[PDB]
Design a protein around this ligand. Structure first.
Ligand SMILES: *[C@@H]1O[C@H](CO)[C@@H](O[C@@H]2O[C@H](CO)[C@@H](O[C@@H]3O[C@H](CO[C@H]4O[C@H](CO)[C@@H](O)[C@H](O)[C@@H]4O)[C@@H](O)[C@H](O[C@H]4O[C@H](CO)[C@@H](O)[C@H](O)[C@@H]4O)[C@@H]3O)[C@H](O)[C@H]2NC(C)=O)[C@H](O)[C@H]1NC(C)=O
Ligand SMILES: *[C@@H]1O[C@H](CO)[C@@H](O[C@@H]2O[C@H](CO)[C@@H](O[C@@H]3O[C@H](CO[C@H]4O[C@H](CO)[C@@H](O)[C@H](O)[C@@H]4O)[C@@H](O)[C@H](O[C@H]4O[C@H](CO)[C@@H](O)[C@H](O)[C@@H]4O)[C@@H]3O)[C@H](O)[C@H]2NC(C)=O)[C@H](O)[C@H]1NC(C)=O
Ligand SMILES: *[C@@H]1O[C@H](CO)[C@@H](O[C@@H]2O[C@H](CO)[C@@H](O[C@@H]3O[C@H](CO[C@H]4O[C@H](CO)[C@@H](O)[C@H](O)[C@@H]4O)[C@@H](O)[C@H](O[C@H]4O[C@H](CO)[C@@H](O)[C@H](O)[C@@H]4O)[C@@H]3O)[C@H](O)[C@H]2NC(C)=O)[C@H](O)[C@H]1NC(C)=O
Ligand SMILES: CCCCCCCC/C=C/CCCCCCCC(=O)O[C@@H](COC(=O)CCCCCCCCCCCCCCC)COP(=O)([O-])OCC[N+](C)(C)C
Ligand SMILES: CC(=O)[C@H]1CC[C@H]2[C@@H]3CC[C@H]4C[C@H](O)CC[C@]4(C)[C@H]3CC[C@]12C
Ligand SMILES: CC(=O)[C@H]1CC[C@H]2[C@@H]3CC[C@H]4C[C@H](O)CC[C@]4(C)[C@H]3CC[C@]12C
Ligand SMILES: CCCCCCCCCCCC
Ligand SMILES: CCCCCCCCCCCC
Ligand SMILES: CCCCCCCCCCCC
Ligand SMILES: CCCCCCCCCCCC
Ligand SMILES: CCCCCCCCCCCC
Ligand SMILES: CCCCCCCCCCCC
Ligand SMILES: CCCCCCCCCCCC
Ligand SMILES: CCCCCCCCCCCC
Ligand SMILES: CCCCCCCCCCCC
Ligand SMILES: CCCCCCCC
Ligand SMILES: CCCCCCCC
Ligand SMILES: CCCCCCCC
Lengths: 92, 333, 76
């Protein structure tokens, strides 16, 4: 309830962007950057409890994989935006 | 119990009329004192306080003719409280900030008399010794922390030091497992430091500590590398998306200065610029130039070729950053 | 939690605004919960405060999903 749940939910947050229309560039972009920054502080915050061991713990791999998902979710949107041929969204 | 009574008489004679105020061979040649350490552990290697904590079994061996006995064939290990009735060298660690002899279950000392007069005197000491660290290449740095064993009141005319066993006097260094340091080398020196009060013997035990970089990739470099890569995403968004690119821009810039500020507070307030500062400051330029890249894009348009600046920047930024890493990592590693 | 609901009075076609509001609120709850739990020991169970912060997290997160549900039904 200190690292895994915040790590799991920020991964869920990044996947809310997939259900938003591709034309909402600011909204989906803030989704990506906010989760990535949130994932960064969680990774930095997580290590603070235990010593400065060189190797990587099981928490580190879970945080690393969750970093891949949130980061891949933003690269996914950049790919989606690359093929967005029109700026205006659906109306009516 | 007959042998116990015999030992009692012998040990009683040695302390009878024993002048604790006078060293062995007082008024005569210097007494040679032999030392051998057993490093139990090294902990709290702190650069905020510029010190390291050292736990060791610190043995001293010297000859004292007054404590010579011949009747008993065995070597006498006596209760540690006898040390208060015996002359012992007044050795101190010059760079020691805070030290103590372990106290439970009793005073962690040893007194062992040998028939020829030799006295083996051991203590279990935990000393926080001062180690001034050159953090210029931190965290890719090698530190050289030392322990300066020296006699306080007795000059070289009254006492001498030597590593008992020479290069085999200190043990346990290989077993010591620091979390963020690898003890690459250790050396033993015998000096003669001169003060205004005379010249004194000096034993210096230096450990060369090499820092492990694996921890700092996890918490320091990779978060800054990923944020730098994140800022390059803005080069893939069309120029007219001002809120998206600017929000991507400032957030990367502001987080980067936050990471730099957050880390440097955990360290002491050294004036110079470390290696982690060089990388974080170097990656601050790319993220800041990434934001200025959009500002030029916005200015050139509202103030075909606009894509070219957005297209060439699409590749040179990951290229120039890689070369910066090649120069940085090659230079420091 | 109260300000999370002002997203419901905002126009549906304000993705940049409501998402920014919803994201801002849900992240703040995590920081408050994380910040609060730091002061306490490393205790391995949910306390009364924890069961409230987690309870409030659900509402704010649902408010964020309320818009995502609204956006999908309209465009999707
Ligand atoms: C009271 O205390 C004394 C002092 O410790 C004990 O006597 C010593 O016992 C030690 C046991 O550790 C003996 O150590 C061995 O000495 C051998 C001979 O050393 C001679 O040469 C050295 C050179 O400096 C002198 O200092 C020393 O006095 C001797 O004259 C060494 O060969 C041994 O090392 C060898 O170990 C193995 C097995 O031999 C080999 O494989 C190694 O390669 C290496 O060659 C070892 O160091 C020593 O002999 C005793 N005298 C000393 C140290 O002066 C008493 O026994 C003790 N009283 C008791 C127990 O009642
Ligand atoms: C700095 O470092 C030095 C290291 O030398 C410390 O100095 C020693 O401190 C200890 C602890 O106080 C001293 O031990 C004391 O020894 C006294 C003398 O013992 C002899 O005489 C008595 C009779 O008077 C005999 O019975 C005994 O067998 C010895 O022959 C004792 O009288 C002291 O007793 C005190 O402590 C006991 C603890 O059980 C109490 O019950 C007593 O009532 C009494 O309070 C004590 O044991 C030692 O003598 C000091 N010198 C040396 C050379 O060791 C310093 O303490 C340390 N700190 C500072 C600030 O200097
Ligand atoms: C952490 O940093 C400290 C620096 O403060 C290092 O300690 C110094 O190390 C050096 C090298 O080990 C010491 O310098 C000298 O080492 C000599 C070793 O012998 C070599 O050199 C001689 C002469 O050059 C050759 O003949 C020989 O074959 C070897 O190649 C000592 O013998 C030196 O002492 C003699 O010279 C001095 C100066 O002329 C005289 O004053 C002495 O009386 C004596 O005759 C000398 O010690 C140096 O002393 C160390 N201490 C310092 C500088 O304070 C640590 O090594 C480093 N940590 C690690 C792990 O390396
Ligand atoms: C010297 C060697 C030094 C080594 C470094 C060198 C670096 C080199 C890398 C340089 C960057 C690569 C892009 C260069 C091309 C840019 C232009 C472009 O858009 O090209 C094309 C698309 O290109 C793609 O399809 C995207 C490929 C890169 C995305 C990688 C995704 C994985 C992210 C993983 C990251 C995870 C994080 C990593 C974790 C550690 C299309 O171009 P265009 O726009 O359509 O117009 C051209 C057509 N025209 C000519 C007709 C007009
Ligand atoms: C012409 C142009 O491309 C524009 C786009 C962005 C502009 C910069 C922004 C930051 C400014 C800070 C200070 O106000 C000094 C001037 C300053 C350096 C500007 C120089 C001109 C730039 C490069
Ligand atoms: C259909 C619809 O309206 C969309 C809008 C928002 C969507 C949710 C976002 C969060 C998602 C996290 C994981 O991806 C699992 C599915 C997940 C719960 C989604 C369920 C379907 C929703 C409600
Ligand atoms: C916190 C350190 C994690 C390092 C790995 C992150 C994943 C890189 C992005 C992958 C995108 C496909
Ligand atoms: C290098 C930083 C990440 C870039 C991700 C965007 C990729 C878009 C490619 C679309 C054309 C194939
Ligand atoms: C005294 C050292 C000053 C270092 C200033 C930062 C250098 C960053 C270089 C970035 C290259 C693009
Ligand atoms: C320490 C003396 C001042 C050095 C200033 C160096 C500035 C380098 C900046 C490189 C990026 C433009
Ligand atoms: C201060 C703005 C920096 C702009 C960097 C642009 C790099 C690519 C230029 C190529 C022009 C064809
Ligand atoms: C980084 C500074 C670049 C300055 C660019 C000024 C361009 C003025 C208009 C002429 C080119 C279209
Ligand atoms: C000794 C540790 C080496 C770490 C190297 C990091 C490389 C990052 C390069 C990123 C280029 C896009
Ligand atoms: C693509 C370039 C990545 C950065 C290169 C890192 C070099 C590390 C050298 C390690 C010591 C030999
Ligand atoms: C084991 C305790 C579970 C805590 C669950 C917190 C959320 C419950 C309240 C939800 C309100 C909608
Ligand atoms: C022990 C179960 C913890 C709750 C998991 C959270 C799933 C979203
Ligand atoms: C253990 C009960 C958890 C319920 C939480 C509400 C759904 C996210
Ligand atoms: C959680 C919302 C599910 C219902 C969405 C409407 C049907 C596509």
């Amino acid at each position: 309830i200190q690292t895994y749940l915040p790590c799991i939910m920020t991964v869920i947050l990044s996947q809310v962007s997939f259900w938003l229309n591709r034309e909402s560039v600011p909204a989906r972009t803030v989704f990506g950057v906010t989760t990535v920054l949130t994932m960064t502080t969680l990774s930095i915050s997580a290590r603070n409890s235990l010593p400065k061991v060189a190797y990587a713990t099981a928490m580190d791999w879970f945080i690393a994989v969750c970093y891949a998902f949130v980061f891949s979710a933003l690269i996914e949107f950049a790919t989606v935006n690359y093929f967005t041929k029109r700026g205006y969204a659906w109306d009516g | 119990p007959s042998n116990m009574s015999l030992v009692k008489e012998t040990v009683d004679r040695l302390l009878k009329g024993y002048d604790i105020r006078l060293r062995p061979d007082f008024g005569g040649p210097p007494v040679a004192v032999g030392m051998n350490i057993d490093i139990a552990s090294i902990d709290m290697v702190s650069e905020v306080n510029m010190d390291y904590t050292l736990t060791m079994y610190f043995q001293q061996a010297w000859r004292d003719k007054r404590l010579s006995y011949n009747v008993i064939p065995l070597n006498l290990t006596l209760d540690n409280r006898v040390a208060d009735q015996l002359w012992v060298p007044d050795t101190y660690f010059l760079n020691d900030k805070k030290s103590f002899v372990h106290g439970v279950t009793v005073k962690n000392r040893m007194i062992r008399l040998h028939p020829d007069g030799t006295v083996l005197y051991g203590l279990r000491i935990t000393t926080t010794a001062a180690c001034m660290m050159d953090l210029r290449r931190y965290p890719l740095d090698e530190q050289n922390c030392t322990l300066e064993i020296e006699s306080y009141g007795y000059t070289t005319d009254d006492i001498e030091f030597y590593w008992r066993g020479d290069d085999n006097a200190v043990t346990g260094v290989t077993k010591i497992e620091l979390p963020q340091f690898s003890i690459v080398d250790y050396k033993l020196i015998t000096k003669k430091v001169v003060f205004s009060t005379g010249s004194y013997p000096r034993l210096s035990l230096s450990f060369k500590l090499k820092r492990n970089i694996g921890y700092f990739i996890l918490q320091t470099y990779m978060p800054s590398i990923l944020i730098t890569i994140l800022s390059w995403v803005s080069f893939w968004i069309n120029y007219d998306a001002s809120a998206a690119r600017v929000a991507l821009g400032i957030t990367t810039v502001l987080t980067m200065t936050t990471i730099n500020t957050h880390l440097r507070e955990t360290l002491p307030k050294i004036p110079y610029v470390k290696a982690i500062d060089m990388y974080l400051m170097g990656c601050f330029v790319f993220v800041f130039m990434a934001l200025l890249e959009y500002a030029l894009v916005n200015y050139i348009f509202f103030g075909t070729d606009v894509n070219a600046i957005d297209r060439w920047s699409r590749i040179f930024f990951p290229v120039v950053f890689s070369f910066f890493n090649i120069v940085y990592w090659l230079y420091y590693v």
